[PDB]
Ligand binder design. Structure first.
Ligand SMILES: O=C(O)CCCc1ccc(N(CCCl)CCCl)cc1
Ligand SMILES: [Cl-]
Lengths: 209, 209
């Protein structure tokens, strides 16, 4: 395949780009990195910012999950119909990234002490996405415009992982709820989400979710 | 088109997009938001993620500093010559954002206890940008390709505030040192960087730097 994903055996920051590739019917290869290979040090030292994912599209080598999402969005026509929609797509993705960083901090950094406070604050963090939906054709299509964008896949992932963290958190958000059901039912996406290559990976690297 | 930036009287997350506008010969309006006005609550409630900057470009309203940078980059032709360069631009900008996040956490959250460890870890955080410069026409031009991008303005800001935090932090990095000097000397940028509207604003909102 022309695309290669180099990552740990986890969903994590590669979940959204994999859904994207799967739902767009694109071929890719997974190169899996074990704790042992990572602790050896040489791969890590070769990575631009000492981190995975690493991504290859022929001889173009990329780092940073949002860089990969933008690159696939650009090349696969999932980045708005014009320059205005492209900006709105970015605004969504930035908000998605912001909550993801808070999620990651909780998971890896203080799950036991921090979880109750995090869940109390969750609805205030989810509301901007409901608002965005309410303002785009009554929330019945995508997060921006009338075609799917890389931000939809990233937002969808963020909502799925939060329903695992806080079951029922979308009960307060009818548009986000319907949106999850709707995108998850796209046939290629539905098949990928049900498959062992997705189901048999943990969400995170430390066994918390 | 016309442009408006709504923000606190600080450089912070608006410094890079202001440098972009100035260097590109663009005109803009500053709407300054005081501590008192922000604490009142109504502006904040009206902001998509309850954060500034808020940006207006004619009828288009944007939030999130990197969304504003990409929008200005897209519409003004500061986003690489092709898809490969656009992707590398994003990769640089995401890396700048990551280190910016750490800087902000230090400044607002942990300045006294945390600064020594932060400064000790700094060279390893700067090395990737030196490397990227080394791989692009010997570091003689821009961070990506041979035309300026929005990532150059963001990286330049990151470098300037870090020289304030850790004087001499670029001395081991010849390409970065020369890049800062060279970009800073661009006539419109030089003029803006010397102006009271930049010089007389603090870097951050809490008086630390
Ligand atoms: O944008 C960034 O860099 C992140 C920090 C943004 C920020 C800047 C200033 C203030 N205040 C000063 C108002 Cl004059 C409130 C006191 Cl801290 C609050 C937040
Ligand atoms: Cl992750």
């Amino acid at each position: 395949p022309p695309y290669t994903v180099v990552y740990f055996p986890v969903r994590g920051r590669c979940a959204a780009l994999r859904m994207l590739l799967a739902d767009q019917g694109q071929s890719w290869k997974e190169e899996v990195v074990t704790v042992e290979t990572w602790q050896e040090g040489s791969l890590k030292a070769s990575c631009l910012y000492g981190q995975l994912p690493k991504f290859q599209d022929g001889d173009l080598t990329l780092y940073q999950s949002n860089t990969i999402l933008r690159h696939l969005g650009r090349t696969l026509g999932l980045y708005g119909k014009d320059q205005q929609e492209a900006a709105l797509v970015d605004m969504v993705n930035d908000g998605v990234e912001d909550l993801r960083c808070k999620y990651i901090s909780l998971i890896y950094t203080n799950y036991e002490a921090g979880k109750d406070d995090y869940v109390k604050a969750l609805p205030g963090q989810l509301k901007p996405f409901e608002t965005l939906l309410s303002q785009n054709q009554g929330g019945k299509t995508f997060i921006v415009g009338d075609q799917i964008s890389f931000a939809d896949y990233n937002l969808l992932d963020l909502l799925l992982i939060h329903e695992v963290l806080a079951p029922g958190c979308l009960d307060a958000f009818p548009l986000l709820s319907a949106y999850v059901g709707r995108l998850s039912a796209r046939p290629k996406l539905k098949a990928f989400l049900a498959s062992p290559e997705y189901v048999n990976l943990p969400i995170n690297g430390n066994g918390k979710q």
